[PDB]
Design a protein around this ligand. Structure first.
Ligand SMILES: [K+]
Ligand SMILES: [K+]
Ligand SMILES: [K+]
Ligand SMILES: [Mg+2]
Ligand SMILES: [Mg+2]
Ligand SMILES: [Mg+2]
Ligand SMILES: [Mg+2]
Ligand SMILES: [Mg+2]
Ligand SMILES: [Mg+2]
Ligand SMILES: [Mg+2]
Ligand SMILES: [Mg+2]
Ligand SMILES: [Mg+2]
Ligand SMILES: [Mg+2]
Ligand SMILES: [Mg+2]
Ligand SMILES: [Mg+2]
Ligand SMILES: [Mg+2]
Ligand code: NA
Ligand code: NA
Ligand code: NA
Ligand code: NA
Lengths: 41, 203, 144, 208, 88, 213
RNA sequence: AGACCUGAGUGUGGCAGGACUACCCGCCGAACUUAAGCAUAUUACUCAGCGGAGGAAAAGAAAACAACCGUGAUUCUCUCAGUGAGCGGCGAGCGAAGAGGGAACGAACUCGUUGCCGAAUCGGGUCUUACAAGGCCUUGAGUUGUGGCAC
RNA sequence: CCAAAGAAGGUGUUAGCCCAUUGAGCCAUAAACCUGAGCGCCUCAUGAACAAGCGAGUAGCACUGUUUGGGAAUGCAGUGUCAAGUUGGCAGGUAUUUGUCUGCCAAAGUUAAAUACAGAGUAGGAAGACCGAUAGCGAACAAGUAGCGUGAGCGA
């Protein structure tokens, strides 16, 4: 919110989170490393 | 997206890994209640295809139904009248088991609106269907143009009237044209317009 | 109307034309078409021969529209020509045009003697109709 | 006695007649004139409500679909996207402007497509598009005089602008040509019918 | 493009003459299906079919596939898929 | 459909010395054991109860009804048939009676009255006025309290100009383009007294045609 | 220590049970009767029974018809048609559909998926004259995915 | 004598003019409805112009049962068995194996009208070639009452 409020008058580099976004990052070969939880139910 | 992987994996129910997962799940479901409330659906891809959304006011329940043919509930298995009606063990219920599970869910919790359901597992004795239900009083539901149709009282207990997908299935409404002419808009509607005597004024 | 029926004439006759011996009882022959082979056999056989049994090939899902094929004969063609046109018609001259399918006919049959020479547009024509109308100065033009 | 009568099949066996024990299954038409009057009054009310828009939307001309009915014409459901685009119209815009739109009809030939394109052009040239704002008119819209002139198309079939459906014209009289005065039409027709009828058997014989 | 009709009621191109208008792969899904199939292995039906094809009983494999699947086209396609799979 | 049959009403059988008709069940009531369900029984069901799908309406061939209207009009052109029907036309100038179209400009019932007296239609209107009475029999209990004769019928070219003739008792109004056989031959009897305006009269040739046109 | 995730307790805010039930929707479901007997059939996918809604319901936007010069969601009416359809101890009996004329008709939209984004979403407090389709705040819910855009 | 009113009710016998009734028209209006998508202010939203895919214990198939005019099986149900992927599926009313053609794209969902009201209700209306106190609803009346039955019910 602060960044957008400042820009009115992109985001810093970060991990990719979420199953949809992470899957897309893998499919497009944009991920350099992928960390997967072992206990998803 | 990831949906494709989940959907393909759920097209492989007879593989060893899916059979292992389903065996563990079916044992656990065996030791639970006939009706169970779930925080999240077991098959998110299927649930979302059927209209489930990860929103306030959306609920998922797992309903268990017993397998087998219907036993005709006559005293001591004795029937009367013509031999044509004398069968006790070989008749089949004219509703499917998914519709039955939806009806049991809807009857039990009358404050909810049943939306849809899907298959999740089955035993030799049991079948488990997860029913999707909506709270019609939640503000999130009432202010959503995608789902607030179900707030209107014509959709109260729509599963009791065969109006969900499973009910439509056993009503024959998956077919159109010449494969469904005697059952549209319903069997009774077609019987009414095929069997009533018309008296034109000048005849 | 009720006043013209035999009931009015029968008021006071007690039996209303059905007799003292044989009464007017409920169903003394059975209901409807009962016993067409047992005790009504003579009636069925002498007035409705052919009623019992089977014959021929089945045709499931009979659609009558693909089979629509009405006919008109040569000596009836004047039904389809305007009154003034039939007179300005003659062999060797300019002839009226009849389009059959718009008049409700599919086949030109060809019974009788043709009265007005004309050009006929037909989906079908019998061989005798075609030859007979060509001898009279007309023609058949196929159409669909 | 029975005598010589038709064998009866009246089919009144089911409990159709209402009585002390049966609800019956009947449909009488005693409300027919009241319902006709109601329908007419409703049409008049709806025309009053939507003035000056025509009561019936614009519909295309189509060909009836069997060998029994293909010489006939009638009004179709809606104009196809190809006819609308050929007429220079967006289907959403045509839907808002009084034109029925049908995305299912496939436009198999040129004659039907062209007749419907002409219906669209005739409608569009006589259309009087009222402005959203009377004080700021945009291109294609009406002015004060045209909007004031108005007039409502109250036709049963909503085609007072394009006219009734058009049939092909009856042929004029002519002479029998020499080819027509020599040839056997029967033999030609028969041979074509036989070519289709015996196609499989001729193929199986010639291929043996 | 379609052949024009002859203008008469019978025959090979029968019909009323109009000027006719002409009639107006899944690689990523294949990739997903391949990954999932490698992940899960063979259905027991596929195992039985592969055993049949290994010992040279192509006919028995086709009959087994027809019985389980209920359709001859699907049975043939499944037998071909198992042949291609055993070739890897 | 339930009238006369709203009872349990079983037959007692032949054991007892009574008739075999069904009888109302129960006790403690004057109708306990009474005959039931039968057309001959008090409180029972009528024989062959009336239905609503009786044929109330008739279809008549279009040509036959046009023929009937034409015959009725020709009959009205005959003074002898008109008086035989019961109209008082012994003072009227001509039959068929044709008047000027200006009566369509009347606004008061008084002017229409003066016009009826002028062309001597007032005698038939008076016959109708004096015939007024209470209907004999049950029809007066129904919404049919009064009866009267028909009287003259004035045919207009259109629906306008009838303002001053509406309240005249014993004067019927008609529109030339929708002429009715029930009014041209009341009771099925031809010979109605018809007063034509000029404009309606000149329209009869195109409405009904000629023997050749 | 603590976390989530499975499940409890209580507080707070709300909803369901009952009535009606003519018509309508889902199930369940006879027998008398007809066949001059009777068992298939018929009565009847009816009555009785168990559920559910409305002002109508249900249906409804083609895995539709057709086989044409082609039609074009649904429903309803005439007709198709008591049918040279068909079903049937092929007996008694039963029995529709497409096309055609019409009523209606501003009739069409949403999700899921795909791919481009990725909390832009929801709820709750609190300001704007405002349990705003608004602003501010908020870990509360939501990344095990809500919401936007596109054919 | 009135009538743009003759239209039926009331009044001690049969009423246009004894009475009531109605026509133009007058007054008052929570909200909702209709009206250049009626008309302003604030707020908020908003239009115009500067490449891949498509719904799985699903569809099929086998047996059984049922339903249908649907006949080597019209729909449905139980159980077993269970796909394909637009080089694809479904349908095309005689089963099969081939190969052509045509239409369409199932297995989430919403939707007004035209239709029903075959023993319903609420508020108003209009009628009848119907019945006329053993008729017509059981009930023209303190009638679902009095009375009867342990009761379900029966019922003047
Ligand atoms: K008998
Ligand atoms: K039509
Ligand atoms: K009396
Ligand atoms: Mg006898
Ligand atoms: Mg019948
Ligand atoms: Mg009864
Ligand atoms: Mg009575
Ligand atoms: Mg029985
Ligand atoms: Mg009976
Ligand atoms: Mg017996
Ligand atoms: Mg019942
Ligand atoms: Mg509805
Ligand atoms: Mg299955
Ligand atoms: Mg719905
Ligand atoms: Mg008395
Ligand atoms: Mg009485
Ligand atoms: Na309730
Ligand atoms: Na209700
Ligand atoms: Na009076
Ligand atoms: Na099944």
């Amino acid at each position: 919110r602060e960044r957008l409020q400042k820009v009115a008058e992109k985001a810093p580099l970060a991990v990719v989170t979420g199953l949809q976004e992470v899957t897309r990052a893998i499919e497009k070969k944009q991920a350099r490393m992928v960390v997967i939880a072992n206990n998803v139910d | 997206g990831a949906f494709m992987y989940l959907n393909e994996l759920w097209k492989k129910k007879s593989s060893d890994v899916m059979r292992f997962i389903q065996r563990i799940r079916s044992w656990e479901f065996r030791h639970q209640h006939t009706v169970v409330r779930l925080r999240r659906p077991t098959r998110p891809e299927k649930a979302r295809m059927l209209g489930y959304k990860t929103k306030q006011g959306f609920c998922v329940f797992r309903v268990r139904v017993r397998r087998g043919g219907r036993k005709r509930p006559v005293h001591k298995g004795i029937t009367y009248g013509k031999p044509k009606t004398s069968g006790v063990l070989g008749m089949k219920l004219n509703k499917n088991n998914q519709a039955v599970a939806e009806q049991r869910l809807g009857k039990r919790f009358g404050n909810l609106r049943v939306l849809n359901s899907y298959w999740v597992n089955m035993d030799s004795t049991f079948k488990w269907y997860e029913v999707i239900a909506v709270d019609p009083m939640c503000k999130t539901i009432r202010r959503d143009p995608r789902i607030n149709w179900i707030v209107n009282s014509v959709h109260k207990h729509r599963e009791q009237r065969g109006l969900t997908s499973a009910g439509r299935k056993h009503r024959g409404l998956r077919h159109k044209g010449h494969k469904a002419s005697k059952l549209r808009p319903s069997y009774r509607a077609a019987w009414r317009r095929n069997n009533r005597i018309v008296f034109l004024r000048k005849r | 109307p009720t006043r013209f029926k035999k009931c009015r004439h029968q008021r006071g006759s007690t039996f209303c034309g059905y007799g003292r011996v044989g009464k007017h009882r409920k169903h003394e022959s059975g209901r409807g078409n009962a016993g067409g082979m047992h005790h009504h056999r003579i009636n069925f056989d002498k007035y409705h021969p052919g009623y019992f049994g089977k014959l021929g090939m089945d045709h499931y899902h009979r659609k009558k529209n693909p089979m629509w094929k009405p006919t008109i004969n040569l000596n009836n063609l004047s039904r389809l020509i305007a009154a003034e046109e039939a007179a300005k018609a003659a062999k060797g001259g300019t002839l009226p045009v009849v389009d059959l399918q718009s008049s409700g006919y599919a086949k030109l049959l060809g019974n009788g003697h043709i009265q007005v020479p004309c050009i006929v547009k037909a989906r079908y024509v019998s061989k005798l109709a075609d030859k007979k109308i060509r001898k009279a100065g007309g023609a058949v033009v196929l159409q669909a | 006695p029975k005598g010589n009568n038709a064998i009866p099949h009246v089919h009144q066996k089911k409990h159709w007649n209402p009585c002390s024990s049966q609800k019956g299954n009947v449909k009488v038409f005693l409300n027919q004139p009241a319902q006709k009057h109601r329908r007419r009054r409703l049409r008049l009310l709806k025309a009053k409500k939507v003035f000056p828009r025509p009561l019936k939307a614009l519909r295309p001309q189509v060909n009836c679909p069997t060998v029994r009915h293909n010489m006939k014409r009638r009004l179709g459901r809606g104009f196809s996207p190809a006819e609308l685009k050929a007429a220079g119209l967006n289907p959403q815009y045509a839907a808002t402007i009084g034109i029925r739109v049908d995305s299912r009809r496939k436009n198999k030939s040129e004659e039907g497509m062209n007749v419907n394109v002409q219906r669209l052009k005739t409608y569009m040239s006589k259309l009087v598009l009222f402005p959203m704002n009377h004080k700021k008119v945009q291109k294609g819209e009406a002015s004060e005089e045209e909007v004031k002139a108005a007039t409502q198309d109250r036709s049963r079939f909503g085609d007072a602008a394009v006219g009734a459906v058009v049939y092909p014209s009856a042929e004029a009289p002519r002479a029998v040509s020499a080819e027509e005065k020599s040839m056997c039409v029967y033999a030609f027709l028969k041979k074509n019918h036989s070519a289709v009828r015996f196609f499989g058997t001729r193929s199986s014989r010639a291929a043996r | 493009a379609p052949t024009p009709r002859t203008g008469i009621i019978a025959g090979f191109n029968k019909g009323h003459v109009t000027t006719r208008r002409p009639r107006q792969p899944h690689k990523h899904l294949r990739a997903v299906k391949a990954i999932i199939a490698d992940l899960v292995g063979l259905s027991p039906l596929e195992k039985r079919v592969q055993e049949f094809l290994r010992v040279g009983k192509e006919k028995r494999a086709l009959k087994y596939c027809k019985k389980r699947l209920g359709d001859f086209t699907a049975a043939k396609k499944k037998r071909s898929k198992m042949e291609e799979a055993l070739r890897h | 459909r339930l009238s006369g049959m709203n009872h349990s009403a079983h037959s007692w059988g032949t054991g007892r010395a009574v008739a075999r008709i069904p009888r109302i069940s129960g006790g403690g009531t004057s109708t306990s054991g009474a005959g039931a369900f039968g057309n001959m029984c008090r409180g029972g069901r009528m024989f062959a109860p009336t239905k609503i799908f009786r044929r109330w309406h008739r279809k008549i061939n279009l040509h036959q009804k046009r023929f009937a209207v034409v015959s009725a009009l020709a009959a009205s052109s005959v003074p002898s048939l008109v008086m035989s029907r019961g109209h008082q036309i012994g003072n009227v100038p001509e039959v068929p009676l044709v008047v000027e179209d200006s009566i369509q400009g009347y606004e008061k019932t008084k002017e229409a009255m003066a016009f009826l007296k002028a062309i001597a239609a007032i005698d038939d209107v008076n016959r109708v006025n004096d015939s007024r009475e209470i209907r004999a029999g049950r029809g007066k209990m129904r919404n049919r309290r009064y009866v009267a004769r028909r009287g003259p019928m004035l045919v207009m070219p259109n629906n306008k100009g009838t303002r001053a003739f509406r309240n005249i008792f014993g004067l019927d109004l008609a529109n030339v383009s929708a002429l009715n056989l029930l009014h041209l031959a009341p009771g099925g009897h031809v010979g109605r007294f018809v007063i034509w305006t000029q404009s309606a009269f000149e329209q009869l040739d195109k409405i009904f045609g000629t023997f050749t046109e």
